[PDB]
Ligand binder design. Structure first.
Ligand SMILES: Nc1nc2c(ncn2[C@@H]2O[C@H](COP(=O)(O)OP(=O)(O)O)[C@@H](O)[C@H]2O)c(=O)[nH]1
Ligand SMILES: Nc1nc2c(ncn2[C@@H]2O[C@H](COP(=O)(O)OP(=O)(O)O)[C@@H](O)[C@H]2O)c(=O)[nH]1
Ligand SMILES: Nc1nc2c(ncn2[C@@H]2O[C@H](COP(=O)(O)OP(=O)(O)O)[C@@H](O)[C@H]2O)c(=O)[nH]1
Ligand SMILES: Nc1nc2c(ncn2[C@@H]2O[C@H](COP(=O)(O)OP(=O)(O)O)[C@@H](O)[C@H]2O)c(=O)[nH]1
Ligand SMILES: Nc1nc2c(ncn2[C@@H]2O[C@H](COP(=O)(O)OP(=O)(O)O)[C@@H](O)[C@H]2O)c(=O)[nH]1
Ligand SMILES: Nc1nc2c(ncn2[C@@H]2O[C@H](COP(=O)(O)OP(=O)(O)O)[C@@H](O)[C@H]2O)c(=O)[nH]1
Ligand SMILES: [Mg+2]
Ligand SMILES: [Mg+2]
Ligand SMILES: [Mg+2]
Ligand SMILES: [Mg+2]
Ligand SMILES: [Mg+2]
Ligand SMILES: [Mg+2]
Lengths: 152, 152, 153, 153, 152, 152
C-alpha cells in the first residue's frame, strides 16, 4: 500500500554540514509525501533506545554520544515501498560502499559520520515513528499529485 | 547582532508543490542557522491571527481558508540581518514583481499562491516565533562554521 | 487571464551550447504550462519575417543569418502574465545588462549570442505563435497543479 | 557508430510533473544530440501500436489509456550507443528497482507512473522514430562539440 | 575585446565552506574562459599589497590577517567585459546588499566573510593577475565554443 | 588513515566542455579536502610518462597527443579512502559502462574522451602527485569541518 511510512533523520553531522534541504529535496523529488517534520535535540537515553539493537557493538557508546551531541531533523515519509525506497536514497551504511547518486555516496566518507538515518523494515519504521513523533505531529493530507505518482 | 531570528513558513501551495527542501537549502546555503522546524496544518484561528493585520482586506477570507487548508512547514532561522535577508531570499510579495534567483521569482506566478511567508520586521518576527513555537521546541546550538561565516 | 500565451525560442547558440533542458526547466519551475514544442531549422526568410521590425538595423543581416544557421527549439507557454514573465526569466536583451538568476545572466555574454528569444507583447506573441505553429500542433491540457498555482482556479 | 538514434518520450505523468526540462538536460549533459522534438497528444490507437508487443499483458489497457490521456514529449537523440545509453539514463522499468542518479531512480515510484519511455533496441528505435516522426521533422546538424565528445570524430 | 582578463579568488572562507566548484561552475556556465588556476596560501605581506589601497581603513589588519589565514583559489578568466561581468557574478561587497543569484547573495552574510574577490577595473585586474600569477601559469588556448559565445 | 591522497585531473575534453567546476564540486561535497590545484597544458613528454603503463597499447599515440593538446586541471585530494573514492566518483573507464551519478556516467560517451583521470592505487597516486606537483605547490590546512566528517 502507498500508505506505508518510514522514519528518516538527518543526523547531527548532516545538520551541521547543511544537508537538511538537500535530503528533503531528494525525498520530495522521488514522489514521497512528507507527513512529519521536526528539529530536535535527542537526549542520550533517546539515542540509546533508538539504537538499542546495537548495544553490544563496540561503537555503541560513541554512536549514542554523537547522535545526542546536537540537533537532528526527524521526518516521516509516506509512500509505496517507502521503507526500502528511503534506504535506496540514503545509500549503504558505510559511505565507502555507497554509490554516487545516494545521500551517503555524494556527501559522506566515514561510517560514523554518515549524515542520515532511515528505518530498515516496516516493523522498525513503525517503532521509530511512534518513538520520535506524537500523533499530533503527523499530518494527514492528500498530495494533489497522487494520481500522477500512482496508477491505482 | 548574529542572534536575530525570523519566522519563515512554506505555505500550503509550497508544500504541495514540493518546494520545502529547495527553500530550506537556500537558507542553509546563505549561512543562516535553523533553530526551529515543524510541519503542521494551521487551524482557521491560527490563520486568522497570523494574518491579523490584513483582516479588513478583501482577500482575507480566501487567504485564511487556504492557509488552513493543509500543512505548512514553519521555521525559525537565526543570523545577522536574517529578517531582511529572509525577505530578500523570498522575493517580492507579488511573484510578478519578484526577480529570478528569489523563491517567488523562480517558482510562483500568483500573489495568492506565493509559496512562502517571512516575518516583515524584528518585532513581528518575535511575535510570530512566539505564536508558532513553544519555548521547548526551539533548539540552541553552535554551527561549527560560525567563524567562517562571521568576522566577529 | 491565466490563458495568456507567449512564444519562446532557444536560438541556435542555445541549442549548440546544451541549454534546451535548462531553459525549459526554468519555465516549468515557475508554473508556466507548455502547450507547444518543436525543434526546427528556420529558413533565412522565416528569420527575416520573425525579426521584420528590425530590418533597418545594422545587425539585421547577421541576426537573420545566424537564426537560420541551425536548429532552434520553438515553444508556446501559457500562464498569467507569461509574456512579461517569460522575458523576465530570459533577462535583459544584452547579457552584459542581465542579472544572475536569469537565463542570459547565467549563460550568455554577447548580445548577438544571447541564447534565446521571447515575444515582447501580447499582440506580438499571438503573431509569433501563429507564424511558427499550426493550430493542430498546440496541445490544450489542464495542469494537475493549476489550483496550487492560481488562487482564482 | 555515433549516428545511432533512439526514441525517448516523456510520458504524460512526466509532463504533468514538470520533468521535461530535467530529462532533456540529462541527455544533453551526457553528450547526446537532439535531432527531433515535439509535444503531442497520442491517440489511444497510437498508444496501442507503440506498445503492440505488450497487447496480451494484463496492464496493457491501462498503459494505453494513460499514455493517450494527455501530452507527451517525443524526442530523437543521436549518439554512440544511444539506444542502450538512453535506457541507462532512464533507469530500471520499475522505479522500485531503479538506482538514484537515473531519471526513474530520482523522480518516480510506480511502474505505471514511470515518467518516460526509451526504445529497447536499434531496430525498435528505427521503428519508433519512423512511427512518431515524418522525415522532414528531423533536423540534421553538427554539434560544435563533436570532436570533444568523440575521439574518432 | 573578448581577450580582457580578470582576477577572481575564492577567499579562505569560500575554500573552507566548499564553494570552489560552485564558483568555478558559475564562471564556466557564463561563457568565460579559464586561463589560470591555483591553490595557494597567501602570506600576510601578499595580502597587504593586494589590498594596499585600503591600508588606512579600520578593517585592514583583520582583512589582511584573515586573507592569509588559509588557502585561497586564485583564477584568471578571459572574456568580453569579464572584469565587470565577474563583479556582477560575485554580487555587492556587503552580502546584505547582494541579490539572490549572485555568489555573495546566495552564500554569504557578513562583509568580512564574503567568500570571493574580483578585480574592480581593467587596470587593477592587470596588476592583480601580474601579482598572483607567473607567465607560465597562464595558459593560452582556444575554446571550441568561441563562435557559439561571440558573434565576431 | 584520513591523510591518504590521490591525483585527479580534468582532461582536455573536460576543460573544453566546462566540467571543471562540476567535478570539483563533487569532490568537495563528498568531504574530500583540496590540497593542490593547477591549470597547465601537458607537454607531449608529460603525457607519455603519465600514461607510461599504456605505451604498448594501440591507442597510446592518440591518447598522448590529445592529453597534450590543451589545458588540464590537476588536483590533489586528501581524505580517508580517497584513491578508491575518487574512482568511484569518476565512474568506469568506458563511459558506456559508467552509471548515472558518476562523472563519466553523467557527462561522457566515448572511452577516449572520458573527461577526467584518477590515480588507480595509493602508490600510483604518490607517484602522480610527485610528478605533477612540486613540494612547495601543495597546501596543508585543516578543514573546519574535519570533526563533522570523521569520527576519529
Ligand atoms: N564507528 C562505527 N559506526 C558504525 C559501524 N556500523 C554502524 N555504525 C553506525 O551506527 C549506525 C547504525 O548502524 P546500522 O543500524 O547497522 O546501520 P544503518 O541502519 O545503515 O544506519 C550507522 O548508521 C552508523 O552511523 C561501525 O562499524 N563503526
Ligand atoms: N489575493 C491577494 N492576496 C494578497 C494580496 N496582497 C497580499 N496577498 C497575500 O497575503 C499574504 C500576506 O500579505 P502581506 O503580509 O502584505 O505580504 P508579505 O508579508 O510580503 O507576504 C501575501 O504573502 C499574499 O499571499 C492581494 O492583493 N491579493
Ligand atoms: N549585434 C547586435 N545584435 C543585437 C542588438 N540588439 C539586438 N540584437 C539581437 O537582436 C535580437 C532582437 O532584438 P530585440 O527584438 O530588439 O530584443 P529582444 O526582444 O529583447 O530579443 C536580440 O535578442 C539580439 O539577439 C545589437 O545592438 N547588436
Ligand atoms: N502496471 C504495470 N505496468 C507495467 C508493468 N510492466 C511494464 N509496465 C509499463 O509498461 C511500459 C512498457 O513496458 P516494457 O516495454 O516492457 O518496459 P520498458 O521498455 O523498460 O519501458 C513500462 O515502461 C511501464 O510503464 C507491470 O508489471 N505493471
Ligand atoms: N569588516 C569589514 N570588511 C570590509 C569592509 N569593507 C570591505 N571589507 C572587506 O574588504 C574587502 C575589500 O574591500 P573592497 O575592495 O572595497 O570590496 P570588493 O572589491 O567588493 O571586495 C571586501 O571584499 C571585504 O572582504 C567593512 O566595512 N568592514
Ligand atoms: N581509445 C581508447 N582509449 C582507451 C582505451 N582504454 C583506455 N583508454 C584511455 O586511456 C586512459 C587510461 O587508461 P587506464 O589507465 O587503463 O584507465 P583509467 O585509469 O580508468 O582512466 C583511459 O582513461 C581512457 O581515456 C581503449 O580501449 N581505447
Ligand atoms: Mg539501522
Ligand atoms: Mg507579511
Ligand atoms: Mg524582440
Ligand atoms: Mg519497452
Ligand atoms: Mg576590491
Ligand atoms: Mg589509469
Amino acid at each position: 500500500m502507498p500508505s506505508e511510512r518510514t522514519f528518516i533523520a538527518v543526523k547531527p553531522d548532516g545538520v551541521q554540514r547543511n544537508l537538511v534541504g538537500e535530503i528533503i529535496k531528494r525525498f520530495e523529488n522521488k514522489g514521497y509525501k512528507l507527513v512529519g517534520l521536526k528539529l530536535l535535540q535527542p537526549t542520550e537515553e533517546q539515542a540509546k533506545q533508538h539504537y538499542i539493537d546495537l548495544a553490544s557493538k563496540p561503537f555503541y557508546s560513541g554512536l549514542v554520544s554523537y547522535f545526542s551531541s546536537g540537533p537532528i531533523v526527524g521526518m516521516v515519509w509516506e509512500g509505496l515501498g517507502v521503507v526500502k525506497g528511503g534506504r535506496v536514497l540514503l545509500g549503504a551504511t558505510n559511505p565507502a560502499d555507497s554509490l554516487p547518486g545516494t545521500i551517503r555516496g555524494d556527501f559522506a566518507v566515514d561510517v560514523g559520520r554518515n549524515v542520515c538515518h532511515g528505518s530498515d523494515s516496516v516493523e522498525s519504521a513503525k517503532r521509530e515513528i511512534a518513538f520520535w513523533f506524537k500523533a499530533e505531529e503527523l499530518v494527514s493530507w492528500t498530495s494533489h499529485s497522487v494520481k500522477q505518482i500512482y496508477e491505482r
